[PDB]
Symmetry: D2
Amino acid sequence: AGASMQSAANITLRQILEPNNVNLRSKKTHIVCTLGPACKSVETLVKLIDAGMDICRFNFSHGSHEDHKEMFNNVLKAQELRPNCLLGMLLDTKGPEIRTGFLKNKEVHLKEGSKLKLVTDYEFLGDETCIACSYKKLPQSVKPGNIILIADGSVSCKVLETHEDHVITEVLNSAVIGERKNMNLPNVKVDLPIISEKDKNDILNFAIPMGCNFIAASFIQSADDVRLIRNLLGPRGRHIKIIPKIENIEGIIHFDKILAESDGIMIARGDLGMEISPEKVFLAQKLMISKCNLQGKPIITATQMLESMTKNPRPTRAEVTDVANAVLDGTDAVMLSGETAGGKFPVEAVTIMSKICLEAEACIDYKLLYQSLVNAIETPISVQEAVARSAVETAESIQASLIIALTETGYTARLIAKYKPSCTILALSASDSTVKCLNVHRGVTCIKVGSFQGTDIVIRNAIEIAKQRNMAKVGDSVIAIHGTNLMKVVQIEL
Amino acid sequence: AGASMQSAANITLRQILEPNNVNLRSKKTHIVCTLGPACKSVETLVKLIDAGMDICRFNFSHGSHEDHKEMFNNVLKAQELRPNCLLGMLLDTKGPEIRTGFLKNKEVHLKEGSKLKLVTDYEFLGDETCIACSYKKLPQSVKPGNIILIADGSVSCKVLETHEDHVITEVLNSAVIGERKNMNLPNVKVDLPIISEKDKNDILNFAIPMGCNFIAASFIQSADDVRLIRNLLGPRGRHIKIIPKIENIEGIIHFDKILAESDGIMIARGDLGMEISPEKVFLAQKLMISKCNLQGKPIITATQMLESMTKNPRPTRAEVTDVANAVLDGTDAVMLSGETAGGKFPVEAVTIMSKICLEAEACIDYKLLYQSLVNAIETPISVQEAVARSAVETAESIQASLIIALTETGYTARLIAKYKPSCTILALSASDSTVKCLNVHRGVTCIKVGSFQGTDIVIRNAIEIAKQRNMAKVGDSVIAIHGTNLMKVVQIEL
Amino acid sequence: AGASMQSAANITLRQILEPNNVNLRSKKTHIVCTLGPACKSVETLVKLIDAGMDICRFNFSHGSHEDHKEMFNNVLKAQELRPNCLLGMLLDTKGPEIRTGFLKNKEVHLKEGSKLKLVTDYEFLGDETCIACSYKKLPQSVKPGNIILIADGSVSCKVLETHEDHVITEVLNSAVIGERKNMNLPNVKVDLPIISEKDKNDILNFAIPMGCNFIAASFIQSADDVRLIRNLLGPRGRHIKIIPKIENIEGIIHFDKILAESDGIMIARGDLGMEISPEKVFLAQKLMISKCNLQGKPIITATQMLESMTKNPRPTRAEVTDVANAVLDGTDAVMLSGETAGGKFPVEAVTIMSKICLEAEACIDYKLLYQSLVNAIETPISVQEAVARSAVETAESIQASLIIALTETGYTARLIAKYKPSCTILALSASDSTVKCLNVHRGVTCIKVGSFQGTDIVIRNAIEIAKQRNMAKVGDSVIAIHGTNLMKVVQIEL
Amino acid sequence: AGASMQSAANITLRQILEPNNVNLRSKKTHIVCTLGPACKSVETLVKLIDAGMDICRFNFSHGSHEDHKEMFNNVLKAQELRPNCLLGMLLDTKGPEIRTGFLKNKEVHLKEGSKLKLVTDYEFLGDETCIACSYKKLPQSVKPGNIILIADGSVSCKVLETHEDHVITEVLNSAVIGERKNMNLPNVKVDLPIISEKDKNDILNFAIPMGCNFIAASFIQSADDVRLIRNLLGPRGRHIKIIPKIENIEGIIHFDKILAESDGIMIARGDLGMEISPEKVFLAQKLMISKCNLQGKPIITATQMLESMTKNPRPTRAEVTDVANAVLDGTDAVMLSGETAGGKFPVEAVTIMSKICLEAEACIDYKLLYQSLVNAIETPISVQEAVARSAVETAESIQASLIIALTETGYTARLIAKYKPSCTILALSASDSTVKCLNVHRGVTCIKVGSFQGTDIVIRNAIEIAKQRNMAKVGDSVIAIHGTNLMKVVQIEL
Ligand SMILES: [K+]
Ligand SMILES: [K+]
Ligand SMILES: [K+]
Ligand SMILES: [K+]
Ligand SMILES: [Mg+2]
Ligand SMILES: [Mg+2]
Ligand SMILES: [Mg+2]
Ligand SMILES: [Mg+2]
C-alpha cells in the first residue's frame, strides 16, 4: 500500500572518537523552533540563531495577535543582528479541538468498568458519571465500539450507546482527570471546520500582513482541507506555503492526496500517538518521510523531539537517537516546541539538536542515497529535473563544495534538494518570498540578490559571498545551475 | 575505519491501520529481562514469559548469592509452568567500578570554575575542595586536560595537576553531589581487574554450578579481558557464552579484537553515554550492530530501552522509536533493566516491547536484507555456510514457514541466523546447553530432543511439535538442514 | 516485443596465450553431427565421438530407410566401442518443400525487368518466360507485391498477378537457374502438411522402432504443427522429444507458442536467411536463444556453422567467431551438416568446433550469468526449481566439481541446466530414454543406472564412476540432488 | 589478467520483421574502406560515401606514391561532391615483412615428416629441402620447438636446429607452396624496424604533405614502436593519429602499454590468425575492444569482414554475424579490404555492412551500456569527464536527438564518445585536422566552423545545420557542451 525505503550509512571509528567542530549553521537539516516566553528577548533569539534555528514557529493555539506581534518584531530585530541568516516564519493554526466540559469539584476519578455519559450540552457541570463534550457532532461521528480518549489519553472509553445529544461509554481504565481536557476520537473523522473564524483571522490579518512564509495547518484530514486554505489565502497569499499537520487516522488514510495538494508535511507525532497505537507511530513517520522524499516535498518531524530538555540540561538517550534516526530516515527539518517556548534550556536544546543532525548527516552514504532516489522515481522526467539531477551527480563526482542555483520561484532549488546532494545548495533569488520559503528544504541556504542582473554577474557575486562565509575556498569546484536549462562547473581561483 | 550498513523496509497502510494480533512469543527479536523484587514471584515471571521474556539477567552488582538463588529457583519453577519456553540464564558481572569517597555533611555543591582535589586515600572525609576516589591508580591514568565525570555525569572536572596520591581538577559546571557516587574517565583506560575476587566467586560458584548460559562481562576493554574470562571458565564453563559489555572508549577502539574473542556483544549505551558525547552513542550502536551482523555474532542493545516505564504505564514516544530502530538496525536482542527489576509496570514493559519488535520485524524487506549480507560477506565461504545460505534462500523463495536445524553445538543454527531468514529457525539439539544458549540469536527457537536418534525421526517429530505449537500448518513447506551437509524441503500433509 | 539478454565474459591474457589441453568431451556445449557417406564407417564415427560428437542427425530429406539403417547400426557399434558416450539420435524430417519444375534446355537465364509466369501444372516443361511450381496453392498464398525466391535465393521475383492456376512475376535480378530448384515465399505462410505420408512413415516406422530420441521437425509454422506431431507420436513415442526447426517468418511470429509446445528449438539459419533479410538473422538467433534460455528449453544453433570446412582443412575466421558467439549467446548445442555428412574433413570439423566451444565456455562469468537468469525469471518458482537453483548456487560458492542429479524423467537435470552451472551436471537415470534425451541440454552428461536402488547407493556409485572418468578427484566437493526434494554436499575422500 | 565485458541487447519482433529504412550515413559505427582499382573512379567513391564510407585506407604495402596520389585526388573530388561527409584519410604502412626466397621450378611440395633448411642467403634458389628466408635474424629469434608458418599458414615447420646462417625444420604437414610467400613466427618477436626507409618516406613525404589523418602502423610490437613513430612525425605530424595494428603475440602481450601510447587500435585479425590458434582470435578481439572502450580509445575491427563479397554479390551468414557481433562487442569502426579495393561488389559490400551496423546498433540497451561503463571506470574522474558524462546521461533521460560538442582538439567529443550515447554526437571544430580525426570514434559526426566565433552563435548555427540535415526537428531537445565546462539543454522551436 505505502512505499519502501533504503537508508545507507558509513560509520568510521574517527567519527565516533573525534569531536565535530564545524559551524552549527553548516548542517543540512533545518530546525523549527517554537517561540514563547523562554525566547522572548532579542538576546535569546540571536543565541538560537547561532545554535541552529532556521524557522520560527508561532503557535496560534495560545496567545493573541499582540502576543505574537511583540514576538515577531523581536525576531525581525534578531534578524537584523544576523544578516547571513534568513529565517522562515511559520504560523501554526489552532485548528479544530475537542475538549471536555467543566466539573463540579474540578476533579473526577473515573473507575474501570464504570459507565460515563458524554453530553453535548457544554453548560452541564460534570461528575464521574456524566461529562460534557465541546464537539456537538460527537454522537453522530462515533459508533458503538469506538474508543474515546480523554486528557492526553489519560483514560479511554468504549462507546456503548449513541443518542442525539449524548453518548454512553464504559471507562476502560481507572484514572483521575480535570476540567476542559482535550479529547481524541481514534479512527473517526472529526467534522469540525479546518479553519475557524479565529483561524481565518490569524491567516488573513496576521500571516499575510506580517509576511509569514508557512501555514502549518493543524489537523488536516483531506485534500479539500488544503484546497480550502489555498483558496482562503488567495492571490494575497499565493507565496505562502501550506504545510498540513498529519495528526489522526484520516490524515494517514488520505495522505497521498493531501501531499499532492501540499507544499510540505509536518508529522505531529505526539498528537498522532493519541489516535494510533504507540507502536505504530514510527511506521507512519518513516512512510510519510519516504513518500515526501520521493515527491521532492519537504517534511518536518515534530513537535517535541527533545521534550525532556525543557526541564533537564541534557536530553535522554532515546530523544537523541530519535533525532538522529529522523535525519537518517530523510526528514528535511526537525522541530522543538516547549524546549524553546517556555523551557529552561532553549539554547542548549537547539545546540545539541544541531550537533546530532551534523553527526547523522556525516553518516549518510550520499551516492547510495542518490541511486536509491533515481531507481525509485518515475522514469519520464522533465528537462528541468534531468539538469538538476546532473548538478547533484556532477557535484558528487568532482567533490564540489557548493551547488549554486539561480531561481526566481525556488523551483530549481527544490528540484536539486529532491536529490539530496552531499554539498550545500546555495539558492540565489530576487524574491524575498522565495529566499524565506526554501528554508524548509534540507540543505538549501538562500541569498537575496537584486533583480535585472545577468546570470554570470550573479554567479560570480555568489562565489565571492560563499568565499567570505567560508562556504567555499580556492581550489574548490562549484556547480552553477540556472535557466533554457544550464549546468556549469567553475573553479575558484585567486 | 568502521563499516557500512543498509536497512530496507516496506511499510503499508494496512500495517499502520490494522492491529497486530499474533502471539507475542512469535517475534524474532528476543528480550533480556533484568530480575529483581518487582518480578520476584513465580506468578510475575510467568507473566513475563507470556509477554515475551527470553533471557533472564541476574545483575550481580547488587544482591548476594542467596538473593540470586531464591530468584533463580523461582525462575526454574516459572520454567516448569511454561515448558515450551526455554529461558536463557545470564549473569551480569559487577566488574570494575570507580566511586567517590564519603563527605562530612553528605552533600557538596561544587561550583563552576572552582578547584577540586581528588585523593587516593579513600578514608578521607571529603568536602567541596577535596574528595576521595576509590581508584588508586587514578593519578597514573589521567593526564592534565582529561575530563573526570562524577555522579552519572552530574559534574565534569578538567584535570589540572597529577601527583602521586592525588589529582587537582577544575570544576567545569556547578552541581550538587552526594557520597559514594560513581565516576567515569572518558578516553582513559581504567586499570582495574576485569574480574575481581568477588566476580570470580560469582562465576565459579554461581554461574557454573547454577548452569548460567551467558556471562555479560561489565566494562570489557580488550581481547585479553575476554581470554582471561575464557581461561577462568575453563573446561567446567566451556559451554558458557562470554558476552562483553562495551562501556567506554577502550572497548570501542579495540571492538574488532574483542568481538573476535567473544560469543556476542552487549551495548551498554547508558554507561557508554558517560564516556562519549551524547550525540555519538547512536554512531557506536549502529557500527557495533553492523559488525556483529556481518560476523554472525549476536548483539544485545541495552540496558534500559523503556526507562520511563519503570514509573509510567506507557513509554515515551522516543523510547518506542528507539526500540523499533534498534530492531531495524539489526539487533538480535533488546534489554530491560529497572523496568522489570523494581518498576511498577514490569509486565506492561515487556508486552509493549514485544509489540514494537513485531511491528519493526514486519517492516523488514528480507530479500534486500539477505542480499546486503551476501554482498558484504567475504567471498570464500565454507560448505557449512553455503548450505545454511541455501536454506535461508530456499525458504524465502518458496515462502517456507520454518527452517528446522539439527545441531549439537548450535553452530548450524548460528550460521542460519547470520543470514536473517524471514521465517522462524527451529533448532533441535540434544544438548541442554545448546538449547539455552541459542536464545541470544534473533529468530532462533529451540527444542530439546533425545540423543542417539536418526535424523529423519527427529525431523518428523519437530514437524509434529511445530504443528501443535501453531508454528506450521498443513500445506506449508519447511526446510530441514543437518550434517555431511544436507538441505531438505518437506511439505506438511495430513 | 521480444526479450533482452546480457552476456558477461572474463578474458585473461593467459587464456589467449596458453593452449587448452583438456579432453574435448569435457565441453559443456554439445555438438549435433549430420551423418552421411563421409562418416559411414564405424572407424570414422568413433573418431567423431572422440572429437566431440554428442548427437547424430539422420537427415531424412535424402536417403531411404535402408540408407539410414546401415548408418544407424554402424552408430550403435561405434557406441559399443565408446561406452562412456551415450549418443542422442535425432531424425530430421524432410517436411514441406517447394520446387520449380523441369526445363526444356535444363537452363534459363532470367533477366532483370523481364516477366515470368509460375504455373501450378508441374508437368509443364518450362522456359525463361514460364516455369512450373510444385506448390499448387501458390497463387492463393502470395499476393501482388510479395517476393518469390528461387534456387537458394539466386533470383527474386516480385508478384505482379495472381490467377487460379498461375502467378505472373517480374524478375528482379538477372541470374541463370536450373531444374527442380527450391523456392521460398518470404513473409507468406506455406499451406502444406507439416508431416507428409513419407514423413509419417519415417516417424512411425523408423524413429519409434529404431529408438530415435529427437524429431527435428522441418519448417514448423505453428503450435498446431507441434501438437499434430505430438498426437502422431502417441503413447508409442511419448519419450521422443519434438524439436521444431524455425525456418521462416511464420515460425518467428508464433515462436512463443511454438516453444511452449516444444521440447526444444533448432534455429535453421541458412533456411531462415531465405525468408528474412541477411542482416536480420542474428537478431532472430539471439532472441530465440534468449527466450529458450529463460524457459529452460534447449536450443540448437544450426545447420552448417563450419560450412567451408567441408572443402577446406581449416574454417574461415568468421565461421570460428560465429561458433564462439553462439556459445556466448547461450546456445545449448551447435550443429554440423555437410562438414560431417559428405565433406573431406569431418573429424577436423568436429575437433575445432569442440575447441572453440571450450574457449568460449571458459570466457563466461558464471556468477553474473546466474544472476541474469534469476533476475529475469518469473518470481513465483516451485520447490523443485528452488532446490535446483540452490544446487547451482551452492556449487558455485564452494567451487564444486560436479552436480550429481538423480532423475527418472530428466526433469531434475533440466531444471539444473536451466541455471547454467559452471560445473558438469552428471544426471543418473534408470530410463534409457532419459539418458539419451538429456544430450540436448548444455552441460549435462548422463549415466545409466539400475532401477530399484537406494539413493545413497546410486550417489556413491556415481562418485566412484566420476573419479574413474576424471570428472572429480579427492578433495573436491560435489552436489547431489534428488527427490521430497533434497540437496546434499559430499566431499570426496580416500 | 585482461578485463571483463558486459553486452546488453533488446531485440523486438518488430525489428526482426519490419525493414529498416533510415539513411545509411546515420549509423554510429564507422566504416574503413580500402582504396584500389575497384573504386578508382570518382563515380564509385561517391557511391561508397553514400553507402557508408567514413575513412579511406591507403594500403602502402602495394602501389607507389603516384598510385596513391591519383587515388587521393580522386577522393578529394568525391569529397567535393559530398560536402556533408568529411572523410578521414588513413595510411597503412607496409611495415616489416618476412618472405621466402625464390625456387628453381617455382613450386615445391613439402611433405610431412621431411626436413627443410631455411637459409639467410636470400640469393639461394630453393628446393623442397632448402629455401631462403628474407629475415636475416631468423636463426637468432627462433629456438628449437618454435613453429614457422609459410604462405599464409599453408605449411607449418617445427624448428629442429638453429645455426648462424640457417635453421633446420621438420615439415609438420604436407602442402605445395610457391615463390616469395609470406612467413610468420608465432610467439617470437620479429627484430625488424617498425618503420623502414620506405615507410619513413611514405610518412614524411606523403602522409604529412597530403594531410593524412591516421597512420595505421603495421605489426606494432611495443610502446617503443609507437614512440618512434611519434618522434618521426614530430611537430609537422603532431595532429596525425597513430593507430597501431596488433598482428602477433608481442602486440597482445604488451597491448596495455601500446594502447597507452596510441591514439587508437586496429585489430588485424587475419594476420593475427597466423600467430595464434584460430580458436583464440575472438578472445583477443573482445579483450582488445573492451580495453579500448574503457580507455575511451577508438578501435577498428579489421581487415576483411565481408571477405567473400569480393567475389560474391552477398556475404556468407558467418560474415554477417561477425560484423554484427563486433558492433555489439563495442567496436568503433569496421573495415573492408579487398571487398572495395579490387572486388566486384565494392558498393554492395559497404551497403550491407552499413545495414548490419544499424541493426546491431538498434539492439543495444544504451542505459545498461552506460552503467557498465560507469561501474568499471576508475572512480576519480576529472571535471571534463564528469560534464561529458552528464551530457550523455541527460541526453538519455530526456531522449535528446543530438549532443552538440564544441571542441578545438577533439578532446571533448572523445570524452563524450567514451560513454556511448544513443544519439549522434555532433562535434563542431575550427580545426580541419580535428574534424577529420574524430571519424574514428563511434557516433561522432563533425562540422567545420569558422574561428573566433562566440559559443552561442556556433551552437545556433549547428542547430540550423542539424535541422537541414534531418539530424534534429522541431520539438526535440539537444545537448550542447563546451568549455570553463558547461552543459546546456536547448529545445528546437519555430
Ligand atoms: K497548534
Ligand atoms: K552489572
Ligand atoms: K531436413
Ligand atoms: K598494410
Ligand atoms: Mg493537535
Ligand atoms: Mg557500568
Ligand atoms: Mg528447409
Ligand atoms: Mg601483416
